[PDB]
Amino acid sequence: ATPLTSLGSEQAMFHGKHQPGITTPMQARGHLVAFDLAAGAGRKEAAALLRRWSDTARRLMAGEPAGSRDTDVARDAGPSSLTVTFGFGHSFFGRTGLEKQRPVALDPLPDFSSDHLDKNRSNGDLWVQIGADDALVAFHALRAIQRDAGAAARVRWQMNGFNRSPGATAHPMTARNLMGQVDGTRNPKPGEADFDRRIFVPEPAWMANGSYVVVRRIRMLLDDWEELSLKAQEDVIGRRKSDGAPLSGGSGATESTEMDLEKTDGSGELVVPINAHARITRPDQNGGAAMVRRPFSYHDGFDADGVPDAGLLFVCWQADPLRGFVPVQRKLDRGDALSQFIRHEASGLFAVPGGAAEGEYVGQRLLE
Amino acid sequence: TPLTSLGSEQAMFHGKHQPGITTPMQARGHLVAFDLAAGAGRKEAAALLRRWSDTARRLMAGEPAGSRDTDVARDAGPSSLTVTFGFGHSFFGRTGLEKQRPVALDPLPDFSSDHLDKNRSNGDLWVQIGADDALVAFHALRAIQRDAGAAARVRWQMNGFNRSPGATAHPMTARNLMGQVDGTRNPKPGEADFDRRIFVPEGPAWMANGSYVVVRRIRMLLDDWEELSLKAQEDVIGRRKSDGAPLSGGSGATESTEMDLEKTDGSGELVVPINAHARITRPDQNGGAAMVRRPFSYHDGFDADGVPDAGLLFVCWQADPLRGFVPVQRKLDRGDALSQFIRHEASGLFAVPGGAAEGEYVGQRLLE
Ligand code: HEM
Ligand code: HEM
């Protein structure tokens, strides 16, 4: 019996080989933020900021207040699986005299033909991912990180997201997105032999045990999507909406049943379409290209014509974007059945170092 | 209490009163207003409320929509979903129902501290959606909005949140983003004068057992608030942040300890300040004016200058605004210590009829 109090009492590790928020389970509430360093903030001011943030992360993740004038917003809650994760944009390095430590992996993402990117709401010197299963715990951490920046950095953009809550379902199971799809079945998992090689930089040296995140604010064209038949929607993905099983499966097939990419109709046509999203994204269709996807859904209102500003805050993790996000998205751009129903409207690519050790701050190897 | 309770708990649709008034607080909220389209009169509004009521009934039972279900809520339990319907002053002129317009919908005063967005205020029709799972809540918002179809457009829509079930080690009163205990003195069904305070009795007959809701989008000036000392913040409310007790209370006092309004300190100054919010808002300071308060917090991001668009979606419930919201806000406008740290930025006043009986729709006695 998992008690209801688990939601609040569950606590994620701040200190680790890897920073939290990568392999951490899905969280109900998410806030992504980018900061740009102030004019005249250099290496010294950035190091001080990262120390402040790391101290704040550490305290909050353990359910402790920030300091004396902590706002009390998270008071009485448990840690609620709070995680805070820090990353560095390509632009950070030129602001701090660290151009020679800028990883080749931060080279800008391609200009994909399907891009519709608000560049103000994209990129940034610094990125912070906050997640928790309690909205006050999450907001408290966002506000404390944002206040820590003070005048030394400014908020460039900031997006809010959500997922299913713990306990929403009778048993824990893969999440859904706002298209109503089972979303998360085929991620690489810790314990798989190639997981570390796929996801983490091995033990420039400041990125040891780090990962590269790609964030994409992807609007779902729900007004078009929701006029489609079940067949049409399922053909876009290649998996069933009911349980996430491959379309190649029978009634007995489940979410775990392997996809049969050769199966055909009586009539000769492939049961899993040739441009289905869950076919064409697989590592075995992309020379081994792989990523961990760990997103939040978003809804930020309606425009004048009733169009919802709703979608997926797509967040993926990889040891090298050129063996993950980039080749896959090159294929998806025009080659994916899903592309017609979505719009990439903001993006970022950030270097996320290893977890801090006792006494350390996140990114200390880089800044020291 | 098992974690699955978050999902399995179910609020009732059918009843003497609509859900979402006395219902416990929920972790996720969507408030939406709609305006009737050209060509939508009384008969089109009745059909709309019939649609909406059927959707609310199904969804509140954890069932899919009756048709074109998106699967977004699939596998989740009801998650304490509630859906609540009301009518604005403007509705009655659009449908030929001017003779049924309650006096209670007469426009709120123009308070000197108002800073209202006219286009995010008011509206013909109001819907309140809340749940403890965000996919359940979004699925209900999207279904209600899609039921509107050609009958009505979305005028405005706001997202809110609260604490999650299980975030605390045992159930406690909510906090808000000012870090205050928020909800202590909310009237409850078993207390002495509750029905007379909150519900139209068995004023136009179609509102029998209904209530009047006042919605205020109140931005919290957190940048100014959070530079105050603890003493200053506690003086603004009249209650302690740590435990919500009256400042007049001793070391043993808790949130429910009765406030002493006459208690002075060693220098003869009142311990609960004369302009403290939790003094001046009490029914006994307002000729018996009272309301149920059942809000959500909001955070919609930052403006270009770093100012959070964050605050309280204040939602209050009363039998008559003239003996609830209106006289209290008249007092608060300039009189309240809190007023300095908030701004009222949107408003709505809606008539929320009684609940639907078995085989009925909400608002039936008005629209048919
Ligand atoms: C809003 C946009 C998107 C939606 C709705 C979506 C939805 C899905 C769904 C339903 C699945 C199948 C179940 C699963 O294995 O998780 C999936 C798998 C996947 N998606 Fe997406 N996706 C989106 C965008 C992206 C993008 C932009 C990328 C990469 C550039 C991506 C990469 C993948 C990968 C790698 C898989 C797993 C492939 C495999 O089976 O091995 N998706 N996606
Ligand atoms: C951002 C805006 C506001 C904040 C932060 C706020 C905060 C609070 C807090 C902390 C309490 C004390 C604990 C409790 O009993 O709930 C309280 C009580 C109350 N507030 Fe507010 N409030 C706000 C706006 C309003 C407005 C606009 C009204 C009515 C016009 C209102 C009416 C009340 C009433 C009636 C009480 C209970 C008084 C009693 O002890 O009988 N508040 N509020």
Numbering used by the authors:
A (entry chain B): 69 to 271, 280 to 444
B (entry chain A): 70 to 271, 279 to 444
The authors write:
We describe the use of online UV–visible spectroscopy to monitor the X-ray-generated formation of an oxyferrous complex of the dye-decolorizing-type peroxidase A (DtpA) from Streptomyces lividans, allowing its structural characterization.
For the present crystal the 0.99 MGy initial structure has two molecules in the crystallo­graphic asymmetric unit, denoted here as A and B, and has been determined to 1.45 Å resolution. An electron-density feature at the distal haem face already suggests the formation of a six-coordinate species, with some extra electron density assigned to a partially populated H2O molecule. Examination of the electron-density maps and structures for the two successive DtpA structures (with accumulated doses of 0.99 and 1.98 MGy, respectively) revealed no substantial differences in coordinates or B factors and no appreciable signs of specific radiation damage beyond the haem pocket. For crystals of DtpA, clear differences were apparent in the spectra of different haem states between room-temperature solution and 100 K structures. The structures allowed the assignment of 100 K spectra to either a diatomic (oxygen) or monatomic (compound III) state, while the spectra allowed X-ray and ligand-soaking effects to be precisely monitored.
